Amino acid sequence: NKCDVVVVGGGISGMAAAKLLHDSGLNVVVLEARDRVGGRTYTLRNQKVKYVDLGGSYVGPTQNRILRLAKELGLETYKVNEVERLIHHVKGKSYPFRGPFPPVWNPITYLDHNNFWRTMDDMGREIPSDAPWKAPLAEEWDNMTMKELLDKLCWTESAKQLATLFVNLCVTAETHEVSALWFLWYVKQCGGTTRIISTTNGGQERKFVGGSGQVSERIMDLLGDRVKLERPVIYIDQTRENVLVETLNHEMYEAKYVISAIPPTLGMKIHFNPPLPMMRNQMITRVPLGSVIKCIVYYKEPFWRKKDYCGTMIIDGEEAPVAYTLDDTKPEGNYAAIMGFILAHKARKLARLTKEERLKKLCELYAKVLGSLEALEPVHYEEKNWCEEQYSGGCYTTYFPPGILTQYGRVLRQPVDRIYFAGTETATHWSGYMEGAVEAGERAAREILHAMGKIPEDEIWQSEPESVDVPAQPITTTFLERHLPSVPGLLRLIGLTTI
Amino acid sequence: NKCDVVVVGGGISGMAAAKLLHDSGLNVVVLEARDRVGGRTYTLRNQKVKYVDLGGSYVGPTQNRILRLAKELGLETYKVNEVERLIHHVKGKSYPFRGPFPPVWNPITYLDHNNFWRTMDDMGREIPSDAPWKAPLAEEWDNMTMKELLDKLCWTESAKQLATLFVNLCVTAETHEVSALWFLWYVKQCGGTTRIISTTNGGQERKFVGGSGQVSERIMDLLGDRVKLERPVIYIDQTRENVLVETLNHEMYEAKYVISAIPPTLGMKIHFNPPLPMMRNQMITRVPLGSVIKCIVYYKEPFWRKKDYCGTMIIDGEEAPVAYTLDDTKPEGNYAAIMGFILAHKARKLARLTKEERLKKLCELYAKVLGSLEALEPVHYEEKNWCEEQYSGGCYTTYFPPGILTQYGRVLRQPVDRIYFAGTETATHWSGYMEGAVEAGERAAREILHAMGKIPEDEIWQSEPESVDVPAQPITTTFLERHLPSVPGLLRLI
Ligand SMILES: *Cc1cc2c(cc1C)N[C@]1(C(CC=O)c3ccccc3)C(=O)NC(=O)N=C1N2C[C@H](O)[C@H](O)[C@H](O)COP(=O)(O)OP(=O)(O)OC[C@H]1O[C@@H](n2cnc3c(N)ncnc32)[C@H](O)[C@@H]1O
Ligand SMILES: *Cc1cc2c(cc1C)N[C@]1([C@H](CC=O)c3ccccc3)C(=O)NC(=O)N=C1N2C[C@H](O)[C@H](O)[C@H](O)COP(=O)(O)OP(=O)(O)OC[C@H]1O[C@@H](n2cnc3c(N)ncnc32)[C@H](O)[C@@H]1O
Numbered sequence: 001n002k003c004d005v006v007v008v009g010g011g012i013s014g015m016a017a018a019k020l021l022h023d024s025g026l027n028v029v030v031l032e033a034r035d036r037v038g039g040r041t042y043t044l045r046n047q048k049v050k051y052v053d054l055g056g057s058y059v060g061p062t063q064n065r066i067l068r069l070a071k072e073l074g075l076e077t078y079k080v081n082e083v084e085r086l087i088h089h090v091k092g093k094s095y096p097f098r099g100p101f102p103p104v105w106n107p108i109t110y111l112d113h114n115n116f117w118r119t120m121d122d123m124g125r126e127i128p129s130d131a132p133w134k135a136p137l138a139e140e141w142d143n144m145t146m147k148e149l150l151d152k153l154c155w156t157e158s159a160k161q162l163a164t165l166f167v168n169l170c171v172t173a174e175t176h177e178v179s180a181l182w183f184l185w186y187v188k189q190c191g192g193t194t195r196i197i198s199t200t201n202g203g204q205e206r207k208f209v210g211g212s213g214q215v216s217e218r219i220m221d222l223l224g225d226r227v228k229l230e231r232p233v234i235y236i237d238q239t240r241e242n243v244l245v246e247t248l249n250h251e252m253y254e255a256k257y258v259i260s261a262i263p264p265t266l267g268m269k270i271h272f273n274p275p276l277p278m279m280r281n282q283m284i285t286r287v288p289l290g291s292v293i294k295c296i297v298y299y300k301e302p303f304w305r306k307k308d309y310c311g312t313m314i315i316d317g318e319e320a321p322v323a324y325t326l327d328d329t330k331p332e333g334n335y336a337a338i339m340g341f342i343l344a345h346k347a348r349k350l351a352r353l354t355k356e357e358r359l360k361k362l363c364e365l366y367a368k369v370l371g372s373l374e375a376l377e378p379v380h381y382e383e384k385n386w387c388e389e390q391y392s393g394g395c396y397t398t399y400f401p402p403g404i405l406t407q408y409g410r411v412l413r414q415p416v417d418r419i420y421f422a423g424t425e426t427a428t429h430w431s432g433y434m435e436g437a438v439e440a441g442e443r444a445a446r447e448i449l450h451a452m453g454k455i456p457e458d459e460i461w462q463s464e465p466e467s468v469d470v471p472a473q474p475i476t477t478t479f480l481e482r483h484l485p486s487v488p489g490l491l492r493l494i495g496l497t498t499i
Numbered sequence: 500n501k502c503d504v505v506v507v508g509g510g511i512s513g514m515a516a517a518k519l520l521h522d523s524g525l526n527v528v529v530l531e532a533r534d535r536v537g538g539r540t541y542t543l544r545n546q547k548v549k550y551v552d553l554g555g556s557y558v559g560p561t562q563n564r565i566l567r568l569a570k571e572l573g574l575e576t577y578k579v580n581e582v583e584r585l586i587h588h589v590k591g592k593s594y595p596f597r598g599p600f601p602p603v604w605n606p607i608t609y610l611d612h613n614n615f616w617r618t619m620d621d622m623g624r625e626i627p628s629d630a631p632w633k634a635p636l637a638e639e640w641d642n643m644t645m646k647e648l649l650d651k652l653c654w655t656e657s658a659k660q661l662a663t664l665f666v667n668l669c670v671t672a673e674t675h676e677v678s679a680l681w682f683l684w685y686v687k688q689c690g691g692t693t694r695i696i697s698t699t700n701g702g703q704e705r706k707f708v709g710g711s712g713q714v715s716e717r718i719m720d721l722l723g724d725r726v727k728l729e730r731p732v733i734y735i736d737q738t739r740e741n742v743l744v745e746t747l748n749h750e751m752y753e754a755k756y757v758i759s760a761i762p763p764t765l766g767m768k769i770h771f772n773p774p775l776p777m778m779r780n781q782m783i784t785r786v787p788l789g790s791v792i793k794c795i796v797y798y799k800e801p802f803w804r805k806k807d808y809c810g811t812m813i814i815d816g817e818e819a820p821v822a823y824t825l826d827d828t829k830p831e832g833n834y835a836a837i838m839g840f841i842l843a844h845k846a847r848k849l850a851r852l853t854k855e856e857r858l859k860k861l862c863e864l865y866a867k868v869l870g871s872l873e874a875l876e877p878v879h880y881e882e883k884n885w886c887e888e889q890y891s892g893g894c895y896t897t898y899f900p901p902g903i904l905t906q907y908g909r910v911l912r913q914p915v916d917r918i919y920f921a922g923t924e925t926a927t928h929w930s931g932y933m934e935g936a937v938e939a940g941e942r943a944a945r946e947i948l949h950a951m952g953k954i955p956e957d958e959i960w961q962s963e964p965e966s967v968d969v970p971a972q973p974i975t976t977t978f979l980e981r982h983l984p985s986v987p988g989l990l991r992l993i
Contacts, residue, residue: 142675143646143673143675144675145644145901147642148647174642174902176642176643176901176902177900177901177902177903232770234733234734234747234770235733235747248733248734248770250749265767265784266767268764268767268768268784269767269768269770270768271731271733271747271768271889272889275887275888275889276889277887278850278884278886278887279847279886281886281887281888281889281892282787282788282790282886282892282893285764285767285784285786285787285788285892285893286787287784288781288784288785289781289784291781345906348778348906351777351778385777387777387778387780387781388774388776388777388780389774389780390770390771390774390775390780393780393781393784394781394784401676401900401901402644402675402676402900402901403673403675403676404676407844407847
């Protein structure tokens with residue numbers, strides 16, 4: 001019944017908030033809708049896989065808060081395999097490449113690719129991390145989808161195709177579904193294009209030994225019976241002295257403050273008395289999550305390594321169910337596996353098939369891409385379609401359609417009386433990731449510590465010391481990368497000499 | 500506890516479904532979240548206004564279902580005042596005009612405006628009312644916003660400003676927020692641009708004497724205590740023999756079937772056991788409602804009529820709070836009033852202000868547009884911001900952002916086990932309107948009757964005879980309107 005703070009949601013963000021509050025000597029309860037903690041992180045354990053992450057999994061340099069939290073809980077990371085060649089499969093044909101990015105040989109196509117990525121980062125520098133609506137051209141960029149932007153910037157189909165796949169992979173949505181301002185923000189708040197897409201030196205470098213679900217589970221161990229499983233919150237009342245929070249199984253909790261640690265749109269599942277202020281009321285109907293099936297196909301051996309492929313495949317084309325894969329083999333070298341994402345409209349399209357039919361499509365794809373008949377002999381298959389989760393709404397995260405971020409963005413973490421907002425969607429650095437969940441959870445907890453007079457305002461927003469275990473290499477450009485002209489820049493140079 | 504059908508939502512759609520099932524001899528219960536019925540229709544009474552519609556209000560020809568249902572409930576209509584001249588206010592100046600549409604004098608601009616409305620209607624003709632995702636170019640049009648379409652079609656800033664205002668007024672959303680495919684379907688399924696925007700012979704022809712809120716109130720009167728007020732539904736369990744529907748105040752209802760008669764996104768307020776199927780689970784997170792404040796300024800007399808203005812103003816620009824107005828005077832000539840909509844982003848921006856501040860801004864606009872100091876002396880003011888409503892989510896209706904209609908559209912009225920779907924959003928003719936609400940409620944009711952073996956499949960979808968009181972005239976075009984070239988077509992011809 002009675003406590004200091006009710007945390008709604010027992011994913012990373014809610015667990016991280018409850019831990020900070022508990023450590024500060026406050027009585028907290030966590031109310032969790034599911035029969036488990038972890039939310040968008042979920043580690044499945046059985047004999048055939050040992051363990052496998054079916055949700056969030058990858059951590060990388062600059063993600064210092066999740067790395068510190070997991071380290072403090074006794075967790076270790078290992079490196080995702082990138083020793084052998086990556087593959088870029090384009091127009092039915094595979095192009096092995098060393099290094100982080102697929103090489104472009106045609107000089108014109110090269111000027112267009114270079115300019116695309118450079119401009120994305122150039123535009124991002126204009127966007128404040130903590131207030132994207134404040135960018136000088138916010139309105140202009142928000143009233144445009146990513147599709148319109150790619151149509152404007154990319155002077156070759158090659159660049160447009162790769163940029164489209166990049167959008168699909170980063171935000172599990174179609175270029176036409178998403179605001180250009182929002183997507184440019186999302187990339188910039190992760191540290192830029194390189195940092196977001198890279199394995200070595202980027203968001204995909206590492207995973208946790210034993211799975212990422214251990215972060216939430218181990219916080220549950222520390223909190224004991226303070227975590228209430230199968231308590232979907234249905235009702236929040238702020239009319240009286242103390243906040244009343246009701247769950248679906250008719251339990252009532254009473255607190256001084258509430259942290260909402262759930263995807264913004266899932267706030268729709270709760271009835272509010274008094275009603276939410278107008279802007280939030282409408283915002284939560286405007287912020288859908290992406291669509292993705294995460295698929296892991298298990299083999300006897302990591303046969304791709306023998307052919308000198310690491311297992312990273314960037315796969316273009318409508319015919320392909322999976323647009324991106326990584327080696328999901330255990331750090332020990334066993335349970336050989338390929339992890340692939342079925343992204344956006346394909347998640348929708350292929351959900352109609354059975355498990356076995358999807359498995360068949362993935363193997364036949366991998367066989368073609370890796371030039372290997374062995375791909376046709378899987379030993380096991382696991383998958384999770386996140387579109388079907390009542391208490392997630394999708395994965396990886398919330399995207400903003402055109403128009404929304406400039407109109408409703410400033411509401412996302414604005415307190416509603418005694419309700420404070422966490423969840424990765426409210427982060428200012430790696431929002432959408434496990435990293436952002438920790439940031440938002442800990443910041444929301446500290447907003448409440450401030451409200452209670454226990455800390456100064458200057459301590460609500462805290463920087464994180466850099467991990468000594470996963471240090472970040474800076475993102476560098478070369479002279480030619482900075483100053484080579486765009487395609488229309490080259491055309492302007494041509495018409496100037498011939499005049 | 501026990502009944503044949505639970506209807507969730509006591510708006511026009513739920514009430515229409517409940518009346519039909521009740522009329523068939525079934526035991527129905529209506530579970531309504533608010534302390535009132537009507538939903539997006541709300542009629543307020545006091546001695547200053549007598550009665551005023553703060554939500555949905557207008558009906559017109561081809562809306563034969565709402566007209567029939569209202570007539571059966573003992574309601575009468577009256578005609579919205581359009582006797583005198585309409586006003587187009589452009590670049591700080593008023594241009595009065597007779598006839599339905601604002602005249603255009605520049606020859607390039609004329610061709611541009613003419614081509615725009617024609618192309619809209621031409622595109623609509625390839626879009627099936629009952630399945631817009633089956634349009635030949637469905638994905639192409641769905642992956643474009645209306646702003647992109649407008650940038651592509653409109654060669655003049657004049658045509659683009661007016662087309663933008665048209666989108667704003669029709670769907671209370673910005674051109675960049677909405678799917679081209681969806682908006683084109685929305686117009687088509689109201690009978691086309693002329694039908695949707697016209698007062699005489701269109702959607703704004705008439706109001707109900709006493710208010711439209713009586714539609715819901717009078718069906719509640721029929722149903723008596725079968726309607727449960729302040730019963731927000733929180734939980735629907737379909738794992739057992741009968742369906743179990745729980746409310747927030749802890750009541751349990753048990754039925755053979757359920758009708759969901761609420762805006763699709765509001766289905767999110769309900770926890771489902773078992774979970775909804777995937778496509779619906781995501782669909783209901785992707786479908787917001789628009790933003791609008793409806794504002795009514797009262798005056799001692801309808802002074803605009805003296806200047807040969809009807810009170811309808813079409814007002815261009817960012818500066819103006821209200822882009823569109825109608826005379827809201829009672830048919831008797833008293834309670835003189837101008838109704839105006841604060842649309843889309845302006846509803847967000849101006850909600851920051853106080854009621855008095857909004858009133859002042861409106862009066863100053865009307866004084867400018869009508870060219871009258873009398874506009875500065877209001878006797879009363881009523882307004883309702885629909886954006887703040889927990890159990891509506893906005894007004895007028897649900898809009899589809901780019902990508903969604905082709906991906907999720909077929910999900911809208913697909914039953915989930917024993918849950919059938921009503922609400923104006925699921926209609927195929929005048930969806931978004933009170934008309935669509937009746938169509939959908941009655942169709943979802945008949946789906947259940949068919950699932951009960953009471954009627955054949957053929958009878959789920961039923962045509963409506965034309966209203967004898969409000970007959971429709973056909974929509975005509977001239978030879979020149981059909982064959983005059985577009986701007987690029989005049990250019991290609993030169
Ligand atoms: C808000 C508004 C709506 C309409 C207009 C104006 C405003 C301010 N105007 C019109 C126009 C529509 C144009 O697209 C219009 C605009 C400009 C020029 C001409 C016309 C109007 O003039 N005519 C018209 O026909 N319709 C208008 N507007 C829309 C209609 O009002 C609307 O379509 C219908 O009222 C919708 O009916 P519905 O039955 O499908 O749905 P709703 O009314 O929302 O009822 C749902 C009820 O459900 C309750 N509820 C929600 N969650 C619940 C839970 N969980 N449990 C139980 N009950 C729940 C809710 O409380 C509602 O009562
Ligand atoms: C689903 C998924 C998520 C992530 C990835 C993959 C999948 C399949 N992958 C990650 C990447 C994100 C990229 O943008 C990524 C992809 C590709 C390459 C590199 C990276 C990943 O690999 N790393 C990573 O850091 N994050 C990934 N993904 C996102 C994370 O999973 C996600 O960001 C965090 O898990 C979010 O944490 P939270 O903010 O705490 O939010 P939830 O997990 O959703 O927890 C909410 C809990 O609330 C409960 N709930 C909901 N409603 C309730 C009510 N009414 N009452 C009580 N409780 C309620 C719900 O059950 C949750 O437990």
